[PDB]
Amino acid sequence: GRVRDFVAKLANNTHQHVFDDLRGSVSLSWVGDSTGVILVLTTFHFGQSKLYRSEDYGKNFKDITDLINNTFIRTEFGMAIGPENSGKVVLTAEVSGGSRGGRIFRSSDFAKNFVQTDLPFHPLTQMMYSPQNSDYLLALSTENGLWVSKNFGGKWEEIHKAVCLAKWGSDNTIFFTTYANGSCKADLGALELWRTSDLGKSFKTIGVKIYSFGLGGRFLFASVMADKDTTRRIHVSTDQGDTWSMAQLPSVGQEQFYSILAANDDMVFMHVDEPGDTGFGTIFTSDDRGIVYSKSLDRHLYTTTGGETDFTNVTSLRGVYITSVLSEDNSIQTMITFDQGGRWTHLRKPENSECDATAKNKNECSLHIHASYSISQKLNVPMAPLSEPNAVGIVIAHGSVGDAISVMVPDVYISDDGGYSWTKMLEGPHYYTILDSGGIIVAIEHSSRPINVIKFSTDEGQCWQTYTFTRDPIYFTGLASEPGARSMNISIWGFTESFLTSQWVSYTIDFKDILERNCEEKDYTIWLAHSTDPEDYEDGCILGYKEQFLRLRKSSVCQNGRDYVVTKQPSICLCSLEDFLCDFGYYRPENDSKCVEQPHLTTNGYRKIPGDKCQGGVNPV
């Protein structure tokens, strides 16, 4: 199954741009959505920078380096793109040794024109925008001062002098911590937490003896040292710190740490490292209040305090997560949960693959997925798992079949129903991407030699076709596309083979003439999610309700468009004893589902799991 006469259609829609400059490093930023503005910041070493801007989704670039008047730019901070569609860009330059303060070039019209200003300080961290109003900024100077600007960098005012860390809250509220004696390092565990809703006109103290703090959605977390030991607990507040309540989590020591893996408006995933350097921890899941925590998974993988973990939220399907556990022999394995952490199991084996050497039972093995950790160990894993919210039930990732993550060269596997079933898509490492909300997928081979071919499929990784886009192969470096997976333009970077003097290059391909027609009512089928056993009266009812999507058929070759929005039709299910969790003074006996009592606020009975929308039936207070 293949379409014909696509070679000419793709040939007409191909644009090459070559950058004449020394090969240093590159940085790519997208300014807004639906504008097609791309800013490329080239740097080389001494100090020298070049700035390019494209207003056509990357088909053509212009040299606007003279706007910033040929001044070296600090790439450590990076470009500070404004939130949403505001087109605010701020750059930080390098100043001489006798400078009073730093210097920034600021634009508010999608980088059409830049304005130069001199700061009264030396910013030591990237500028931060207020989510509710982009005109506000804050930064920390080298002397740990806190400077806040209310007119987009025109003027700044110092509102404190010993700030360790700061960050915008909600509704233009600022939370920051301060120290008194010594630096912020030697004074750890004896800090204070401050809040100010008037942009530093009136302050307030909301905590003491703090060890760290952070924002996890509609929660405020602060790790407080114990009064007489080195053990530190977790305190959580949801009133902007007005009132705090102790969380029901173990008190870790000084050699351990916490870590938020994913924080919604209702649930939060917490990781608690076990004592010792064994290299694993545990996962707890909270309730709607963010106070009561129940154990979810054990022997979770976490390299170190600054290390990496394989936890992954599958955005395509509701309540699906994937993570790596640690076995008894230190052999990593992959687990998946569909109940938002209720149960974990192995990934289903592909129905048409053979187990590798890692599997002792040649008729019994499972699929395992490479992730951040595998990339850390320097394996052949060009990319991590990919998934888009607007492409329903699609997941792509490298993996191997067996009883443990192997070290051989991995293949690529794809699932088109959320993760229940998989199948081998390509052989060998690749760089993959999704365009037009799952309309067309593209892939580039991962090789050590120049490549001049790109593959693409229109039936969700079923039929693949090869297009030769360049006559001169280039060393591939990466793919770029508009965030959100709703465009049809794809940019292919790299650098030419020129041995005497190499150069950068980019090829942009537009698939407007491949998807000639626009999808209609007929080009859609009704699909039920989480369906396992049709016999069930409430088949595929997760967290109390079902959902019936309308998904584009694989055979249908058509364009969803930029205005496509997924369709759904939820229906609730009767409640049961499995929709509730335990309260402070109760626990689940083993081999049963009831919540009995264990051998200040008070609780009576059970609690309804966050995200659950069932109604009717069993209701144990």
């Binding site: 240093g24 490093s25 590159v26 940085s27 790519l28 930023s29 990076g78 470009m79 960050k167 060890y211 760290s212 703090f213 952070g214 924002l215 996890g216 977390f221 602060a222 790790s223 740490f257 916490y258 870590s259 938020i260 994913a262 924080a263 305090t305 470096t477 990466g478 770029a480 970077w493």
Partner: peptide, 15 residues
Amino acid sequence: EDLLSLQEPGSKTYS
């Protein structure tokens, strides 16, 4: 240290 806040992505970089 404790990672109590989600770290959003950065910027695409090459070399």
